[PDB]
Structures are given as C-alpha cells and as structure tokens.
C-alpha cells in the first residue's frame, strides 16, 4: 500500500460542502490518496484508490 496521508478536513482546515477534501488544503487529495484513516467530515475526495 502507498503512504497514506491523513487529514482533519472539517474538524480543522476548511469545512465545506463538496470541496472539503477536494481542495488543495487536503494532503490526501494533493498527494493522490484516499481518506483512509482520516478525521475528515464531509469528505468528498475524488481520489478513490485505484484498485482494479
Ligand atoms: Zn481532507
Ligand atoms: Zn484525508
Ligand atoms: Zn477526506
């Protein structure tokens, strides 16, 4: 498994509707990772782990 960044988008950072984890203040998003193990609230992260 790749290095998984963790974020608290919602608890801190920037609470939003869609752009919570989808903005560049989210380390996961920026580093091409899903929010596995995060404390993000209202996480819309388009980086869903590519598992084919
Ligand atoms: Zn986030
Ligand atoms: Zn995250
Ligand atoms: Zn998230």
Swiss-Prot record:
Subcellular location: Nucleus; Chromosome
Triggers of expression: Msl-2 protein is only present in males: production is prevented by Sxl protein in females, which controls splicing and prevents translation of msl-2 transcripts.
Positions annotated to bind Zn(2+) 3: 7, 9, 21, 26
Residue span(s) of domain CXC MSL2-type: 2-52
Modification after translation (UniProt): Autoubiquitinated.
Binding residues annotated for Zn(2+) 5, in chain numbering: 21, 35, 40, 43
Chain residues that bind Zn(2+) 4: 7, 28, 35, 38
Cystine pairings recorded for this chain: none
Similarity section: Belongs to the MSL2 family.
Subunit structure: Component of the male-specific lethal (MSL) histone acetyltransferase complex, composed of mof, mle, msl-1, msl-2 and msl-3 proteins, as well as roX1 and roX2 non-coding RNAs. When not associated with chromatin, the MSL complex associates with msl-2 mRNAs, possibly to regulate the amount of available MSL complex. Interacts with Clamp; promoting cooperative binding to DNA PionX sites and recruitment of the MSL complex to chromatin.
Domain notes for this protein: The C-terminal disordered region (CTD) undergoes liquid-liquid phase separation (LLPS) upon roX (roX1 and roX2) non-coding RNAs to form a stably condensed state, leading to nucleate the MSL complex on the X chromosome. The C-terminal disordered region (CTD) forms phase-separated droplets with either roX2 or, less efficiently, with roX1 non-coding RNAs. The MSL2-type CXC domain and the Pro/Bas region recognize and bind specific DNA motifs on the X-chromosome.
Job of this protein: Limiting component of the male-specific lethal (MSL) histone acetyltransferase complex, a multiprotein complex essential for elevating transcription of the single X chromosome in the male (X chromosome dosage compensation). The MSL complex specifically associates with the single X chromosome in males and mediates formation of H4K16ac, promoting a two-fold activation of X chromosome. Msl-2 is only produced in males, constituting the limiting component of the MSL complex.
The protein's name in its UniProt record: E3 ubiquitin-protein ligase msl-2
Organism ancestry: Eukaryota, Metazoa, Ecdysozoa, Arthropoda, Hexapoda
């Amino acid at each position: 498994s790749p290095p998984k960044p963790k974020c608290r988008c919602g608890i801190s950072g920037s609470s939003n509707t869609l752009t919570t984890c989808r903005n560049s203040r989210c380390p996961c998003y920026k580093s091409y990772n899903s929010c596995a193990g995060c404390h993000c609230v209202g996480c819309k992260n388009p980086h869903k782990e590519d598992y084919v």
